[PDB]
Design a protein around this ligand. Structure first.
Ligand SMILES: COc1cccc(OC)c1-n1c(NS(=O)(=O)[C@@H](C)[C@@H](O)c2ncc(C)cn2)nnc1-c1cccc(C)n1
Ligand SMILES: COc1cccc(OC)c1-n1c(NS(=O)(=O)[C@@H](C)[C@@H](O)c2ncc(C)cn2)nnc1-c1cccc(C)n1
Ligand SMILES: CC(C)CCC[C@@H](C)[C@H]1CC[C@H]2[C@@H]3CC=C4C[C@@H](O)CC[C@]4(C)[C@H]3CC[C@]12C
Ligand SMILES: CC(C)CCC[C@@H](C)[C@H]1CC[C@H]2[C@@H]3CC=C4C[C@@H](O)CC[C@]4(C)[C@H]3CC[C@]12C
Lengths: 579, 312, 312, 579
């Protein structure tokens, strides 16, 4: 495993931090643990103070009248790293002593504690053209060296690290919310009763929200349109406590609920960034600097303990409205945020907007029980973002591991990955008959996803693809891969190809949630990709085909959020494009 | 009435001085707005642009009235130009006060309540604000265009440009129309805009004081400077626009309050000095709203995160 | 002398129509120039901008003369506005012809002799040419301003705006100054500028005819269109500025030619018609100069050398 | 030995030309010989026509007005490639036959002949801000494929390779110019007689011109200033046969020549591009596309048989003017152009605006009779732009081979170089007794200049670098390189350093002619370099000294035009930045 490092303009002051994203619970949060190098010869009489600048910016840019910086301080805890005054005596984290083992005593530690009630890092959407800086709350660990605290900060002697604070879905479930409001019109023989509800209270970004609406339209007056709106209650308690809003998920069905009728329907609304990419003031989750991130995650305040939490408190609620021909609406609360991810999320656009591997020789000969380390010299630093694939010849690829780390669930222990420098490796202890299959090393950090050159041993809930029948050496083909059990917005359906009797190659990719598409230079603009929420389908339209386009094509699915390699591959399709 | 001998000679000279100063300053400020044209800063630059246009056109028709006072109050130009000059003067009065009030409101929204300022679409709201501002100013000054003419009486035959309210049932309503139009103007161009501006600036002052509560020793000095600019802005507006509206409402009140005619003489001959005092703000504005905002002045004039090893 | 009854009703109609068309078109062309202006770093766009300003200001003062003709030749405005409107009209006449001539000369220098066009500083020369063009136009029109006045009740109180050549020169020079000013105005505003324009365009036409000799089908048609547009420019200049200057010089020669004195009254009634014919140039000028140039229309809406091995 | 290649976007139409430039000697020019690959399938029945597009662009920009492109054809001849014309019957040049020996018979040949009288490739200096395309005469071999000449041309099915035409200075010298203009004054008894002359008739770009102004003044009228002007007669003889002029160099000496005086002092004037970069209309030697190219080279006609040459002829004059206090001037014609370069000039900024080398041997034993294959790998392509150098004990570096193949004069023949891929090698067949030194390999393609790592075998005119002395551990130090015997404008001067017992490392560089300077990343902006012509001396101000600055600094010269590694090395000074 690895550890997060940041430097300073001097380069002497190096800050070591563990998992960048921190979990805050309804009672207490994870203490901040870190270390920083120090140079006593340069540190004649200064002192290296590290502090938790947890501050809320509520003014676009700054100094609007040349001196007005609208950045309040929600919390700051300062501590001198060296000499640590014998006043806290807080035993070092195993991580900290590990860093000492890596660096030495000059790497002095520091442990921070956050108050139980503080805002979760969230940033409001600047908009199509705002640039500047995002209005929102943000945490930053800042370490600077000075003989006294009041001294002016120094451009060279200072380090800033944008830490993020997040809340993950509680392990327990929650009661399904309910909403009932009875409205009487001019006719009140049986006043209209609203019987809307919601399937589950805790949801993750992308999982379709199945708004279940049922009503008895006894009253004569009819309703034309039912408006369903997963709306973001952003409670911006900054000076003037307010509840600015903006709808994320919007749906206008045509369900005209005629009178003396019982209407009942379930509508699937998936709140994703792309469909609301421009609604200024949308609260998104923590940004390190500028990257695209999911919508703001619901915060879990202490029940019945509303301290009037300054900053942004984000909650999400389904507004269901019936529009009378000549407007009965109610609200449903729900909590939306990620699960507890074993892998600490990488806060980048994981396949960020080339690389090539060199896998060990394909003639690795080994019998049963003969352990072997299949190596692979990589082109560059993939940063432990590598997956090994038990590509069994004639059958679909199989994920062995994510991120050159613990194995993908259910993959037995016989496999194990070793990442070193700009090269990786996977070892196997005992070669059970199944281990008589081809192996591949794969990188998922930079588009295009780049696999290994393959290695075959020598012993001596569905994915359906429509399209085939080799044809059109220069025409156009529509191959449609559909996944019966994977939310389109919850995953990125990748499109790879293995050249005829050759290695695997990535071609196309779709990111539903973010609503952005990725292509391969090997096909560049020739290949189009798309997917629809209709029936969990993803169409791939190859254009101006070629003999070189002869290949075998596979789709796949990657967890949309914190893209962790490839964990499901399609049945494949041998398309040797011909007449 | 016994017009002052001094006034006849004093008013034209100061009128020419205001013409020169205001027109050249507003030319400079509009020149800045044109030259920059980066579509980059001053999200509400259109408000200052509209204020500059209103101010320039407010002083541009001035030389005609300077001649009017130098001509012993004998308008040489046509009826159309009396109408147009008066209409421009009043439209620009109202648009100047309106643009000042709207700019104060924009600053209030972008300082005290910055959350909404960042949220909302600033540029389009500002453009619609300017459009409605100008349309409302034109519709408020329409009566002083439809009720203005030339030529009154007297063997002197001196053509006099004046508001002839006598067009609408003069015998039925002469003081009625005078007071009604005067009160409407002074209560929908000054009282409402001025109170809006003053409340906006009071909240701004409170919140800037709070923001600079502690900051630092430099910070409280900057607070002193910011409170200073706020007071100087509101008080220059006050000094300029109080004499005019005050004497105007006093005169309108004298109709039903049996004012002392002898002192009503004083009111009559002090009014022109009040109108040039009103013009003082028009002259001086470019040296505050553009000067103290050095955007105009400029127009005229790290390492990186890294990973390593967690050796067990 | 008898002014035509038809003329009194007709002339203001053409005047107002020209006002609308020319003002709108010049506003549009100036709007286009301002939409881009500096960024494109154009060279001769300054001449188009100056010519658009000239035509716009040419039509702007026109409605005053429209009411002058509708008022049975009564100038209701002041002596100052008679002076200013006449001076603007003449400055704009001269600056329009001068900017057309300068545009023609710029095109000649940039087509027939492109080597020098690349050589010289187009921006500096163009800007200095524009500055001297405007200064010379102002100095050419200064005498009309210094000699334009108002009065002549003529037992009807019909106040009239005219040149009072008796203002400066004594009665001894009664027709002499009329002759001098008219002949000088023509010979330094039309004859010389028109000769420059015509010779420049003749050389342009000859050189384009020679240049487009090659190619086939399409190229010859493009050359034909280019010659057609040159012809359209020069002939729409001629048809418009020929009647005005021609009748002007004919009435001028009538001093020492003693015309039949009925063709003379005919000339007197047609001269305003020649004035609107002259205005036709400014009216149609945008829809030709901006239309033809694609820039206005746009505003409105591989391998690489390698090395190898020479195996010996 | 390499050869020039160009190709169409298709990738099959590949033009191969022997050498981009040619000499138009008086009698004739060198015929243009080249070859083109062909595919009769892709060329179904369309043929590859290859033509010499000798054109003259005479209007700025591309289309000033629709249908008006300001280009005239000064020559075009066409050849049909495949099958070859049965009537041509012109024996192939050697180079084409070698191309067949490496390429296929589908490499159809072509030979072009230019008329004796045609303009030399020259382009007028566009200006600080002119954009468009510089107007001038230019040749561009164009090969396009069609069934007939009138048939429409295809943007892809077309190769447009700019060929330059140049006239190198005649081998022999010529008659120096003179000037004798006589003007009288009040005392007309002895009218002024002008005896200004010039040193030589042939100059190369940079060689300072010593204008020898000798005048006998006896008339009372004295002249205040003397104006020496190297001016560029640009004889544009297109359409209007004008003689546009621009002064390249303007020396202004305050010689207040008074009555009864005879000033014959020679004044030096060196034309160069830097101090005339903005004089719009200055003619310059042909650019490939945009590369900064020196001034126009004096074109030579045929004893005045001026066939109204429809191109930008260029000839240079030296005007000497004397300005009376109360203006007598004369002309001196001279011809300026490069010598005959054995290596065909590289028509690019040779050290164009990282590439590191590695050397294998370092220390490998070899006594007499062993050829040492001193090999080297390069990060990227250097294109035979490496110069071999050796360091005899405690002495300055010496150049063994230039152009990676060529042989610096005087140097014995034992040395021999070999290009291969992005790697090179040097060999010494018979190790002459003076073979005990360490060897490097100085690549000169991309700034910084990166050399070899040193290879010391086992045996088992002047340059003044003044300003030594280990002082100033962090200050600014000035070192003076006086390179007497090399015009500063005639040579780019280089500053390098060698770490204790390590290889050489480049530091800084200044090219006076172009008037522009290059610095090394290792010293970035810390180091300053500037050459003054007065003493022909380069001052190097190493600023903000450091212990890292402890090394041995060395000076070098390089032929300013067609920069060929380093040809002269200075004494070198061991500087130990310290107190
Ligand atoms: C002196 O004033 C004018 C002189 C010349 C032209 C005028 O107008 C275009 C104005 N004038 C007017 N005329 S008036 O309306 O006839 C006004 C005279 C009449 O009502 C009145 N008699 C007495 C009292 C006490 C009050 N009031 N009213 N306002 C303005 C105005 C003009 C410029 C700027 C400002 C702020 N104000
Ligand atoms: C009718 O014309 C005018 C009417 C109204 C205002 C005028 O002026 C501003 C002009 N006018 C003037 N007046 S005039 O000079 O008194 C002119 C009337 C007098 O001389 C004259 N009577 C008769 C003959 C035959 C010759 N000459 N001269 N030119 C222009 C002018 C105006 C616009 C456009 C053009 C091309 N021309
Ligand atoms: C003293 C009296 C006699 C002068 C009369 C002058 C009148 C007739 C003139 C002066 C200026 C003129 C106006 C100037 C501008 C416009 C705007 C345009 O959209 C419609 C025409 C209109 C509205 C003109 C109509 C006629 C007009 C009002
Ligand atoms: C019929 C008679 C009484 C009308 C008299 C009006 C005259 C005197 C007025 C009307 C417009 C005025 C001019 C308007 C603009 C300027 C330009 C400025 O730089 C100097 C003053 C000057 C030149 C003004 C002087 C006075 C002026 C010429």
């Amino acid at each position: 495993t690895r550890v997060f490092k940041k430097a300073s303009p001097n380069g002497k002051l190096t800050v070591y931090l563990g998992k960048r994203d921190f979990v805050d619970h309804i009672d207490l949060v994870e203490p901040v643990d870190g270390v920083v190098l120090v140079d006593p010869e340069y540190l004649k009489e200064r002192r290296v103070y590290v502090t938790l600048t947890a501050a809320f910016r509520y003014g676009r840019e700054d100094l609007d009248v040349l001196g007005l910086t609208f950045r309040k301080d929600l919390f700051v805890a300062n501590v001198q790293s060296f000499p640590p005054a014998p006043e806290d005596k807080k035993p070092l984290t195993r991580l900290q002593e590990r860093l000492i083992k890596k660096l030495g005593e000059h790497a002095y530690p520091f442990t921070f504690e956050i108050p139980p009630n503080l805002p979760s890092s969230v940033t409001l959407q600047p908009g199509p053209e705002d640039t500047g800086k995002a209005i929102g709350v943000d945490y930053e660990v800042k370490a600077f060296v000075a003989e006294n605290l009041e001294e002016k900060i120094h451009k060279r002697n200072s380090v800033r690290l944008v830490i993020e604070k997040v809340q993950y879905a509680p392990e327990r479930p929650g009661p399904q919310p309910t909403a009932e409001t009875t409205r009487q019109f001019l006719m009140s023989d049986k006043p209209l009763h609203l019987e809307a509800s919601l399937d589950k209270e805790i949801y993750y970004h992308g999982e379709p929200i199945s708004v279940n609406v049922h009503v008895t339209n006894n009253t004569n007056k009819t309703v034309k349109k039912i408006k369903i709106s997963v709306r973001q209650y952003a409670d911006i308690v900054l000076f003037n406590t307010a509840q600015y809003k903006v709808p994320v998920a919007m749906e206008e069905a045509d369900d005209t609920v005629a009178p003396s009728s019982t209407f009942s329907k379930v509508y699937t609304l998936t709140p994703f960034l792309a469909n609301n990419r421009e609604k200024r003031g949308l609260a998104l989750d923590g940004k390190l600097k500028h990257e695209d991130t999911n919508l703001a995650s619901s915060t879990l305040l202490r029940e019945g303990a509303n301290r009037e939490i300054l900053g942004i408190i984000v909650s999400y609620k389904v507004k269901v409205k019936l529009v009378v021909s000549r407007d009965v609406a109610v609200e449903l609360p729900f909590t939306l945020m990620h699960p507890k991810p074993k892998e600490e999320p990488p806060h980048r656009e994981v396949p960020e907007h080339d690389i090539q591997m060199t896998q060990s020789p394909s003639s690795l000969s080994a019998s049963v029980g003969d352990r072997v380390t299949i190596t692979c010299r990589a082109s560059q630093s993939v940063s432990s973002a590598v997956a090994w694939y038990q590509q069994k010849p004639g059958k679909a690829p199989k994920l062995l591991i994510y991120s050159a780390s613990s194995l993908y669930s259910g993959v037995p222990s016989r496999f194990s990955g070793s990442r070193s420098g700009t090269d990786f490796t996977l070892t196997i202890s005992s070669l059970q008959p199944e281990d008589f299959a081809t192996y591949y090393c794969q990188q998922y950090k930079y588009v295009p996803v780049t696999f290994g050159q393959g290695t075959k041993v020598e012993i001596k809930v569905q994915l359906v693809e429509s399209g085939g029948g080799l044809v059109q050496p220069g025409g156009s083909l529509r191959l449609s891969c559909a996944a019966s059990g994977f939310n389109v917005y919850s995953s990125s359906i990748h499109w790879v190809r293995q050249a005829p009797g050759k290695g695997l190659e990535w071609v196309a990719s779709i990111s539903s949630y973010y609503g952005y598409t990725y292509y391969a230079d090997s096909v560049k603009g020739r290949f189009t990709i798309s997917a629809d929420t209709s029936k969990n389908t993803a169409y791939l339209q190859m254009n101006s085909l070629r003999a070189e386009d002869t290949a075998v094509y596979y789709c796949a699915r990657s967890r949309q959020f914190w893209y962790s390699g490839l964990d499901y591959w399609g049945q494949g399709t041998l398309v040797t494009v011909s007449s | 009435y016994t017009d002052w001998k001094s006034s006849g000679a004093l008013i034209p000279a100061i009128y020419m001085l205001v013409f020169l100063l205001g027109t050249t300053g507003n030319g400079l400020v509009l020149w800045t707005v044109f030259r920059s044209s980066r579509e980059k800063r001053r999200s509400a630059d259109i408000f200052i642009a509209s204020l500059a246009v209103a101010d320039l056109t407010f002083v541009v028709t001035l030389p005609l009235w300077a001649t009017y006072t130098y001509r012993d109050y004998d308008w040489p130009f046509g009826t159309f130009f009396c109408k147009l000059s008066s209409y421009l003067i009043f439209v620009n009065m109202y648009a100047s006060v309106f643009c000042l009030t709207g700019l104060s409101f924009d600053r209030y929204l972008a300082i005290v309540r910055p959350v909404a300022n960042a949220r909302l679409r600033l540029r389009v709201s500002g453009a619609v604000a300017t459009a409605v501002l100008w349309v409302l100013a034109a519709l408020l000054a329409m009566p002083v265009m439809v009720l203005r003419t030339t030529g009154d009486l007297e063997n002197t035959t001196k053509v006099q440009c004046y508001m002839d309210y006598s067009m609408v049932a003069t015998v039925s309503s002469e003081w009625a129309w005078e007071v009604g139009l005067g009160v409407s103007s002074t209560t929908v161009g000054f009282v409402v805009p001025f109170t809006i501006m003053l409340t906006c600036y009071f909240f701004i002052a409170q919140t800037i004081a709070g923001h600079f509560r502690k900051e630092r020793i430099e910070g409280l000095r900057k607070r002193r400077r910011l409170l200073s600019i706020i007071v100087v802005l509101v008080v220059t507006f006050a000094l300029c626009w109080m004499p005019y509206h005050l004497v105007k409402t006093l005169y309108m009140l004298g109709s039903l309050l049996h004012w002392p005619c002898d002192f009503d003489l004083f009111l009559m001959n002090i009014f022109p000095y009040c109108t040039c005092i009103s013009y003082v703000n028009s002259c001086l504005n470019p040296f505050l709203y553009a000067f103290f905002d050095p955007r105009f002045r400029q127009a005229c004039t790290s390492c990186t995160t890294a990973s390593s090893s967690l050796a067990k």
